[PDB]
Design a protein around this ligand. Structure first.
Ligand SMILES: [Mg+2]
Ligand SMILES: [Zn+2]
Ligand SMILES: [Zn+2]
Lengths: 105, 91, 1116, 194, 77, 151, 290
RNA sequence: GUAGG
């Protein structure tokens, strides 16, 4: 990386290649706005529906939880949880609570 | 920030800084392109190459941070910790 | 006859000797190197003509130089007697297209002769591909046209120097014998009143011990040195005596730590100086040494001898004694004198052939070392010529020269003039020579010897001032490597026709007159008094018949680029320097037009340049079409020439070629049949001729700026095509192969509207910033989707497929219409580098018009940026109603001392509307009548040679007698000015203004390339400060000087943000972007990063740099 | 650095000749080389100046002492008249008068009042030959150098505010014309060291 | 309607320094900007713009306008 | 006076004119140091460079202690030597010559307090010159009671 | 004896013991400061410190191996000398004998070489840093401006103020969301340019020229949109920068914080710098044509 | 490396 870069002075091949680990502020703030808007639309729905979808898709922890995995803290059945998840997906699929999330993809 | 004191660095201080000890000239595998063990770029001395991914793969997710997997000994944290932690060679 | 179009000439003296082949420098040297048919033809032509010429080709010279290899037994040997070449497989255009180094095979007949077997075995062996010089002096390497430039250096031989030492209060004399390749030896006298020798400056020593070490005895040395008390003092002070004692002393001093040994010493000195391999003095070295030291015909080739050593000792001591004239040592009487290194007698230029010969010689020496090692570790009778050699050294070295070497430079194809001035330039920078930092005041400045050998005007005006220089117009190369110039022979006060070529030193002997000096009707001098020059650059005069040589033409000193400027004598030195430096940067336009006012040499500088397409047979044209022109000769050969259309040049400009010749026109051999870029009827045309007036105008032309009509924008008068080529490679990676395809992931359907099914954009589909040109997709990335993305996809019912888009897009700020796309594939017959499966290169071509910010300049060093393009009506319009196309500040002209531009303008006007002068009978009228420039029609060009240019009386008389343009009136007053009506207000201006035609060029410093802005972009890796440059969205640098300015104001906060938030702080940067876009106040910066890197580095040197606080440890 | 015996006998309007052009180039190229070298030397000098002078900062409103520095108000005073010095502007203007002045038993310039055209003109008219201007050399301040002694700045036309960077502006002012100096001995005269 | 819209000399006399003025105007502008970014939590400590406001504006211009009108004040701790 | 006159006559030759305060700052900076001679009671080395302020403090200390003061002489030194000799190692290292100064500071164990300009620019803190100064940073802005009454 | 006293006193006064003169363990750099980044095409790239570390490690290992087995004094002494040669190169290559050339075309950058010189860490990455929110372009004279006005091309202004333009677009409801606003600004529709013309005003930008000899090199201006791609500058202030118009280029920095813009309003304004500080004479009244 | 400043 300390090669002359073909230039006798003031240059180094080590100062011409961009990295990839660096966080792009644009993408980061877009993600933050996505998180806030999704949390807002999530609060718009019922608090119970909100909580169950959040725990299923893991919106507070990195790893999502399985259906029956939610039926221990909340004390519900593996098929009840599936049913409320299904009707949550049905409601969120409504064009009402989709537009604000369309551009986010 | 009130001063930047500088003095002669003894052997004990160099040991204190070190989070391990280098024992080989290895850097990476020629076929897997991953850092080798106990040489330069070793994960067990400097830090994981990817965010929260241990070398063996016992831990790969973000939730269970601040723990060392007994397989390879890597400590799951942000990759940026590599930029700070330092080792030391013995003579 | 019909070589060039009609052009009236204002010359006053007829040039005897026509300009030589402007590009002979490269082509002849390479022809000598190859030893092809042309070189032998020239050698025999010179020999029959009597001119000296080398009869030994460089390549066969180096191959014969490597003697047959002998082992410790010397049983076997290998002779490389003869080489040969065959037609190269690839065509020049094909090599340019497919990235192939244009080359031909090199076969040599190797003969292995062994005495132990007593047998000779002959075999033809292929040594390696050899790059070849095309007919235009350009080396096509990897599809890029490189050029190699001759290099000035100090020729080998004996040199002497005298200096003054303040401490000694007396002069100190020194000498050196600089070799071609071997180690260098120096010899100082009266350093402290004694003498000594530097053997590579190893240690202090005397001359006496060296002489004793040689076979010459003390007695004979005293006998030959008894006439100089200095040497007597040296030796009587010398305590040591005897050859062996001196030998062991010098051996111990040179290589201490081991006991002395007689044979070891003897062989070491022999290897150091008398071995023919270490100290091989070049042919020029001996040729110079014999003359400088006066030895009469020593060995033609060979290392230094003890006789030369004693001769230089004599020369040095004689120079010390104060004697000026002394008997030569084994030679005639000669002057003893310190020699100045700057003098062109001691400066020799390596041309292309010599450099390539040196590099291939190094390669062949490596080959000899390898094959000698192999022979030392090889068995007898398992030895063949084809097995023992190894072709790796030679090809490795030749490629390592043609790439990554200072003298191997990128061709500049801005216009044919740029090509020529790149070909001819001599560079003092290079390996084993005057580097950048080695420069001094003395070398850079001009010397009295750079006359007719190096133009003193054009040199880069940047830091490398004077370390590069163009070759003179009439210059020629000596076989040794010196530069000659012609001179007409003058006898008994008359002018003999014969011309003799003189070198740097030989010119010193005679006294040479000046071409500008008048010459009467007879061959004798018109005036007894005449200016001349003589030894040392003196310019004293000598009336009467005393001279013997005179410059063949007035334009000897000036180079080709400089000689383009008309009315050069009037301009200052600096402004002609700038003007010549600028003509190389012009860009060709959509349509070119030859200059109305300009020297008569542009035709030759165009024809000799390679860009034009000239016929090579004298035939008749049958069919004419833009793509190709078909001609037939009377012999019967049918030749069809292909005209290049819109092919990207090296710098990124079109190279379109037009067609001149009609269908039924005849042709003489060499006639131009098609223009290149910036050419018209075969005559150079780098710009266009505008109407111009000198007057301040509302402050829109303040401090060099320029104002011009919108007629230029409207008629495409100043418009240039520009083609950008960008490529992508379907590389294969560990996870899998990349695919170029139409199916791109996670994009709208509309963006993929112009893309073909294969995924490559169509031809002619206009593009804009952010568009898609070719659709490439990564095989896969390890995806660990985030919870928010998972929810969004589940709600929307889409699949995040592994393949990722990495398609090439048009770069930001770039527009254009695609004209051409080329595709190469692995599985097809085409070969690509390893790994890559497919490559696609796409052209985008646009037509940039002249707009605000574009630079502009003329030929006399007057340059400025456009500042306003006013409408057509706002321009102050002349009396008849013609607007003035461009307005120039007059304040610049007296201050910048370039009065010529003014003269040109008047003559320019004179060329637009023709002049009629018949029977007027005035002095200028008679001069015009005899010259022939008496009757002219409007629009015809005029030629004013660089130093034979028109005087002011002629211009005034012509202005007085311009042809009536309309209504029988002259719009310009005899003073040269005209009345200009205002455009905006409408009333006439108070006094007449100067107006006329001026040639203006469009420099390549356009505004489109320079613009750059950055909100946020890439960052650097080791330290996260944003990486600079327009090619990667770089941030401007806030320097130490710049910070000083901000600290002057007392402003502390602006500095803190400039140093922490805006860069070098990754944590705060995203926070600041969040705060801005959300709408809150900026947060509080923390510590930067580069300080952390620095303390970590300083901790790695065993220094425990602690960031402490007043109350113990600090918080960070 | 030599001189020829045969000067050019023509003007750029008339048009030089060949050898005349050559011997003009002789000086032109040397001039150009000098400018490039001068920029390297002036830039280096400016850098050195700032670093030694960076520490000083005006860190006190007014001084605690009274000692001053004597300057000549008016020099080259012809017979029977008083003439102000040619370079009074770069010497005593903008300073501060530490002690009060009395020539006819009455104050003419009150203490700690700047020196402009009117005050200096009145003082020289009264016939004063020298004055005691306050200056930074004799300034005694525990912290840096007080504003009162430094006088008034030049870019503002008013007394210097506390905390201004006087060292950096001083160094920049010294270094700015270094490029503009561009002068050298036209001829050595055949003697080295004289 | 410009950066130089409030003449500087009046601001300078009230403040007494060329640096105290910038610090004090900047603090006021920060307060106003954070008030406009309050978005409704309604902290009592914050206060609004005393002088009338345009539909689009920068807080610093309003701050400097108050200083010129002199309705504010400062007191070093 | 000789130095200022010499430099000014050098400058005005072409025509450029600068005030004398600018030169006087530097000329004062040169002579700040002093050469201690007869360093008997002061107990430090003799004939080595010494800051004027520390010289005065040491002289006051020793005369208070009852011992006589070590002598000293003014010493004019170039700008370069003066910059290298500065108390703060970090600023000195940032100057042209780095290895020697870093080595000497390391062996001497000199803790650099961050007072100054070129020391704080690297750390990214606020330079203590003008708006960055302490007294100019710790005010509070309050609208007047009558202003809040106005609304 | 004076120099010896000086150095001896230093050890005596400071707690650090002299044994640190001779080190015993060699610290290593954290790896990201010596990155072995991956390049497209199967190639690689590495900072030279890796090579020096490898050499010292190899030689130490071989010395250890030779010490475990009974070995001659000559060989072990030679190896220890080699280890000394290696560690010294790591601290500073080329301070003794011939510099480790490595590939042969150039010396090898050691640890000390990064802290010293024109390209060193001090004088290229702690004093003079690069910065975002900036631009550059050729200049042309603008006489119709005032003493505090400069013309910026549309593209330059748009790329400098992108966050502000996006926030304004979402506030005016032209853009539905931040992502859609970003899409619209990258597309560059006329509504974006209208919003830009609204937002730039009453916000100072610092124009600057490269040599910046004296503190008038950086001056604040109130921006103004204009077509073309060349900045427009006021003639009067041109002579203060020493700015010709043959062909020039000027950086245009942008202050963001409240303090920075306040400073550019009060101090660095182009109208409050009439007098040059060298001699207290006016500098903003040029004379070429007027 | 070479151009422009
Ligand atoms: Mg300029
Ligand atoms: Zn693991
Ligand atoms: Zn004071």
């Amino acid at each position: 990386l300390h090669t002359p870069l073909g230039e006798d002075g003031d240059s180094e091949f080590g100062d011409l290649i961009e990295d990839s680990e660096a966080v792009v502020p644009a993408d980061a703030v877009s993600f933050t706005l996505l998180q806030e808007q999704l949390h807002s639309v999530l609060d718009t729905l019922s608090e119970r529906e909100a909580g169950v979808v959040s725990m299923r898709f893991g919106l507070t922890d990195g790893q999502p939880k399985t259906l029956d995995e939610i039926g221990k803290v909340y004390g519900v059945t593996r098929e009840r949880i599936r049913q409320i998840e299904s009707k949550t997906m049905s409601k969120l699929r409504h064009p009402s609570r989709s537009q604000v999330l369309r551009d986010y993809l | 920030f009130d001063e930047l004191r500088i003095g002669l660095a003894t052997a004990d201080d160099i040991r204190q800084w070190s989070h391990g000890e280098v024992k080989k000239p290895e850097t990476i595998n020629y076929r897997t392109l991953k850092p080798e063990k106990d040489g330069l770029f070793c994960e067990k001395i400097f830090g994981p190459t990817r965010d929260w991914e241990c070398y063996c793969g016992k831990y790969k997710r973000v939730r269970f941070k601040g723990i060392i997997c007994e397989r390879c000994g890597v400590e799951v944290t942000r990759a940026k910790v590599r930029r700070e932690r330092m080792g030391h060679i013995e003579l | 006859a019909s070589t060039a179009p009609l052009r009236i000439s204002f010359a006053k003296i007829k040039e005897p000797l026509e300009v030589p082949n402007l590009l002979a420098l490269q082509t002849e040297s390479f022809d000598w190197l190859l030893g092809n048919d042309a070189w032998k033809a020239r050698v025999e032509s010179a020999l029959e003509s009597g001119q000296d010429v080398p009869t030994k080709s460089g390549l066969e010279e180096i191959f014969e130089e490597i003697s047959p290899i002998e082992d410790f037994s010397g049983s076997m040997s290998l002779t490389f007697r003869d080489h040969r070449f065959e037609p190269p497989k690839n065509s020049i255009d094909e090599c340019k297209d497919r990235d192939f180094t244009y080359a031909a095979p090199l076969f040599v007949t190797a003969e292995f002769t062994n005495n132990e077997t007593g047998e000779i075995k002959s075999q033809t062996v292929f040594m390696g591909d050899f790059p070849l010089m095309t007919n235009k002096g350009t080396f096509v390497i990897n599809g890029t046209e490189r050029v190699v430039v001759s290099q000035l250096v100090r020729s080998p031989g004996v040199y002497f120097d005298s200096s003054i030492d303040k401490t000694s209060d007396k002069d100190i004399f020194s000498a050196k014998i600089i070799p071609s390749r071997g180690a260098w030896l120096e010899m100082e006298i009266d350093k402290r009143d004694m003498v000594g020798v530097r053997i590579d400056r190893k240690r202090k020593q005397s001359v006496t011990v060296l002489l004793k070490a040689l076979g010459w005895t003390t007695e004979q040395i005293l006998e030959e040195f008894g006439e100089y008390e200095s040497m007597r003092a040296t030796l009587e002070k010398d305590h040591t005596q005897g050859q062996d004692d001196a030998l062991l002393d010098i051996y111990r001093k040179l290589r201490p730590g081991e006991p002395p040994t007689r044979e070891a010493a003897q062989t070491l000195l022999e290897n150091l100086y008398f071995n023919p391999k270490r100290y091989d003095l070049a042919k020029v070295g001996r040729y110079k040494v014999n003359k400088k030291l006066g030895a009469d015909e020593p060995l033609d080739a060979g290392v230094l001898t003890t006789d030369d050593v004693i001769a230089t000792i004599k020369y040095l001591v004689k120079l010390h004694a104060g004697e000026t004239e002394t008997v030569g040592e084994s030679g005639r009487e000669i002057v003893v004198e310190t020699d100045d290194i700057d003098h062109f007698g001691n400066r020799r230029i390596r041309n292309v052939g010599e450099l390539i010969q040196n590099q291939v010689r190094t390669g062949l020496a490596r080959m000899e070392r390898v094959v000698r090692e192999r022979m030392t570790t090889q068995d007898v009778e398992a030895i063949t010529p084809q097995t023992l050699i190894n072709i790796r050294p030679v090809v490795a070295s030749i490629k390592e020269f043609f790439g990554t070497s200072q003298l191997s430079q990128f061709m500049d194809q801005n216009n044919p003039l740029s090509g020529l001035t790149h070909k001819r330039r001599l560079n003092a920078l290079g390996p084993g020579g005057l580097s950048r930092e080695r420069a001094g005041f003395e070398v850079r400045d001009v010397h009295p010897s750079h006359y007719g050998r190096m133009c003193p005007i054009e040199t880069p005006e940047g830091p490398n001032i004077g370390l590069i220089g163009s070759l003179a117009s009439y210059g020629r190369i000596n076989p040794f490597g010196f530069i000659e110039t012609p001179y007409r022979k003058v006898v008994e006060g008359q002018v003999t026709d014969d011309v003799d070529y003189l070198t740097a030193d030989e010119e010193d002997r005679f006294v040479i007159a000046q071409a500008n000096a008048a010459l009467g009707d007879d061959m004798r001098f018109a005036e007894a008094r005449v200016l001349v020059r003589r030894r040392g650059g003196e310019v004293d005069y000598v009336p009467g018949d005393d001279v013997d040589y005179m410059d063949v033409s007035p334009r000897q000193m000036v180079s080709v680029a400089t000689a383009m400027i008309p009315f050069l004598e009037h301009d200052d030195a600096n402004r002609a320097l700038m003007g010549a430096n600028m003509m190389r940067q012009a860009v060709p336009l959509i349509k070119s037009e030859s200059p109305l006012v300009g020297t008569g040499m542009e035709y030759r500088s165009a024809a000799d340049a390679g860009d034009v397409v000239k016929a090579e047979k004298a035939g008749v044209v049958q069919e004419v079409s833009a793509d190709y022109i078909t001609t037939t000769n009377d012999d019967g050969t049918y030749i069809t020439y292909r005209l290049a259309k819109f092919s990207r040049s090296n710098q990124g400009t079109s190279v379109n070629q037009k067609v001149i010749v009609a269908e039924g026109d005849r042709i003489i051999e060499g006639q131009v049949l098609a223009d290149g870029p910036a050419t018209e009827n075969g005559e150079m045309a780098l710009g266009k001729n505008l109407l111009v007036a000198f007057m301040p105008w509302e402050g829109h032309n303040y401090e060099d700026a320029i104002i011009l009509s919108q007629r230029l924008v409207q008629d495409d008068v100043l418009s240039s095509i520009h083609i950008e080529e960008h490529e992508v490679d379907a590389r294969d990676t560990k996870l899998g192969p990349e695919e170029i395809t139409r199916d791109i992931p996670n994009v709208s359907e509309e963006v993929l509207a112009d893309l073909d099914e294969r995924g490559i954009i169509r031809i002619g589909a206009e593009v804009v910033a952010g568009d898609i040109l070719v659709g490439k997709v990564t095989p896969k990335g390890e995806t660990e989707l985030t919870p928010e993305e998972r929810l969004l996809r589940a709600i929307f019912g889409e699949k995040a497929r592994e393949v990722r888009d990495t398609s090439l897009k048009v770069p930001h700020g770039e527009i254009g219409k695609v004209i051409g796309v080329r595709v190469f594939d692995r599985e097809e017959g085409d070969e690509l580098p390893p790994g890559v499966n497919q490559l696609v290169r796409v052209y985008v071509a646009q037509k940039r018009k002249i707009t605000d910010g574009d630079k502009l300049a003329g030929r006399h060093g007057n340059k400025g940026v456009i500042s306003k393009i006013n409408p057509i009506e706002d321009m102050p319009f002349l009396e008849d109603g013609t607007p003035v196309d461009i307005i120039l500040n007059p304040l610049a002209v007296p201050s910048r001392m370039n009065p010529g531009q003014v003269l040109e303008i008047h003559l320019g006007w004179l060329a637009s509307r023709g002049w009629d002068v018949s029977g007027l009978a005035e002095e200028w009228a008679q001069r015009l009548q005899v010259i022939g420039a008496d009757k002219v029609e409007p629009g015809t060009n005029v030629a004013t040679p660089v130093f034979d240019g028109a005087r002011e009386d002629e211009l005034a008389g012509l202005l007085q007698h311009t042809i009536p343009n309309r209504d029988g009136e002259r719009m310009v007053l005899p003073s040269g000015k005209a009345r200009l009506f205002d455009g905006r207000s409408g009333e006439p201006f108070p006094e007449p203004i100067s107006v006329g035609y001026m040639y203006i060029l469009k420099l390549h410093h356009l505004v489109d390339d320079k613009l750059h802005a950055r909100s946020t972009g890439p960052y650097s890796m080791i330290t996260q400060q944003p990486l600079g440059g327009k090619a990667q969205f770089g941030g401007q640098r806030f320097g130490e000087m710049e910070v000083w300015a901000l600290e002057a104001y007392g402003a502390a906060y602006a500095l803190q943000e400039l140093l922490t938030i805006k860069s070098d702080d990754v944590t705060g940067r995203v926070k600041v972007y969040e705060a801005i876009v959300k709408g809150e106040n900026i947060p509080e910066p923390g510590i930067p990063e580069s300080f952390k890197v620095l303390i970590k580095e300083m901790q790695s040197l065993c220094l425990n740099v602690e960031v402490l606080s007043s109350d113990g440890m600090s918080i960070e | 650095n030599e001189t020829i015996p045969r000067p050019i006998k023509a003007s750029f309007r008339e048009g030089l000749s060949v050898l005349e052009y050559f011997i003009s180039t002789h000086g032109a190229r040397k001039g150009l080389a000098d400018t490039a070298l001068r920029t390297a030397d002036s830039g280096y000098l400016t850098r050195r100046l700032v670093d030694v002078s960076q520490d000083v900062i005006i860190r006190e409103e007014d001084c605690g002492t009274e000692r001053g520095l004597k300057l000549p108000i008016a020099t080259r005073d012809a017979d029977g008249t008083l003439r102000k010095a040619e370079d009074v502007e770069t010497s005593v203007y903008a300073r501060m008068l530490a002690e009060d002045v009395v020539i006819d038993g009455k104050v003419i310039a009150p203490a700690n009042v700047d020196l402009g055209d009117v005050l200096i003109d009145a003082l020289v008219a009264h016939g004063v030959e020298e004055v005691k201007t306050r200056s930074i050399l004799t300034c005694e301040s525990q912290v840096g150098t007080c504003a009162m002694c430094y006088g008034r700045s030049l870019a503002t036309g008013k007394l210097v505010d506390i905390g201004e960077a006087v060292g950096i502006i001083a160094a920049q002012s010294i270094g700015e014309p270094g490029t503009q100096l561009t002068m050298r001995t036209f001829h050595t005269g055949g003697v080295a060291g004289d | 309607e410009g950066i130089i819209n409030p003449p500087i000399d009046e601001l300078l006399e009230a403040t007494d320094s060329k640096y105290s003025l910038v610090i004090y105007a900047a603090k006021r502008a920060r307060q106003i900007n954070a008030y406009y970014s309050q978005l409704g939590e309604g902290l009592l400590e914050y206060v609004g713009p005393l002088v009338d406001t345009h539909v689009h504006e920068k807080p610093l211009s309003i701050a400097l306008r108050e200083i010129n009108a002199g309705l504010l004040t400062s007191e070093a701790i | 006076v000789h130095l200022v006159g010499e430099v000014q006559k050098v400058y005005n030759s072409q025509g450029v004119s600068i005030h004398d305060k600018h030169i006087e700052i530097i000329i004062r900076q040169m002579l700040r140091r002093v050469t201690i001679i007869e360093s008997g009671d002061a107990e430090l080395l003799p004939g080595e460079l010494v800051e004027r302020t520390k010289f005065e403090t040491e002289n006051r200390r020793v005369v208070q202690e009852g011992g006589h003061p070590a002598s000293g002489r003014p010493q004019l030194m170039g700008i370069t030597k003066a910059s290298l000799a500065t108390e703060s190692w970090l600023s000195a290292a940032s100057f042209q010559e780095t290895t020697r100064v870093l080595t000497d500071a390391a062996i001497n164990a000199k803790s650099d307090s961050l007072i100054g300009l070129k020391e704080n620019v690297i750390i990214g803190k606020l330079i203590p010159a003008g708006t960055g100064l302490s007294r100019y940073r710790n005010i509070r802005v309050e609208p007047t009671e009558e202003a809040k009454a106005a609304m | 004896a004076l120099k010896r006293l000086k150095v001896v006193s230093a050890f005596l006064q400071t707690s650090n013991s002299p044994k640190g003169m001779v080190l015993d363990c060699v610290p290593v750099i954290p790896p990201d400061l010596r990155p072995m980044v991956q390049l497209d095409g199967g190639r690689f790239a590495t900072s030279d410190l890796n090579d020096l570390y490898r050499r010292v490690i190899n030689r130490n290992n071989r010395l250890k191996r030779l010490l475990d087995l009974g070995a001659p004094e000559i060989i072990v002494n030679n190896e220890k000398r080699m280890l000394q040669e290696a560690v010294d190169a790591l601290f500073d290559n080329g301070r003794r004998g011939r510099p480790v050339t490595g590939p042969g075309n150039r010396p090898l950058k050691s640890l000390s070489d990064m802290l010293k010189g024109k390209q060193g860490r001090f004088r290229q990455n702690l004093l003079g840093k690069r910065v975002d929110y900036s631009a550059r372009s050729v200049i042309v004279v603008g006489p119709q401006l005032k003493l505090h006005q400069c013309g910026l091309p549309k593209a330059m202004a748009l790329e400098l103020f992108k966050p502000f333009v996006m926030k304004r677009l979402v506030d005016l409801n032209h853009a539905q969301n931040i992502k859609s606003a970003k899409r619209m600004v990258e597309r560059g529709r006329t509504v974006v340019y209208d919003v830009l013309e609204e937002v730039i005003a009453e916000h100072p930008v610092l124009l600057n020229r490269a040599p910046t000899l004296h503190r008038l090199g950086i001056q604040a201006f109130e921006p103004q949109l204009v077509e073309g791609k060349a900045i427009q500058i006021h003639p009067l202030v041109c002579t203060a920068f020493n700015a010709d118009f043959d062909g020039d280029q000027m950086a245009v920095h942008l202050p963001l914080s409240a303090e920075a813009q306040a400073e550019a309003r009060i101090l660095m304004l182009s109208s409050n710098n009439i007098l040059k500080p060298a001699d207290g004479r006016p500098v903003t009244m040029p004379t070429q044509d007027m």
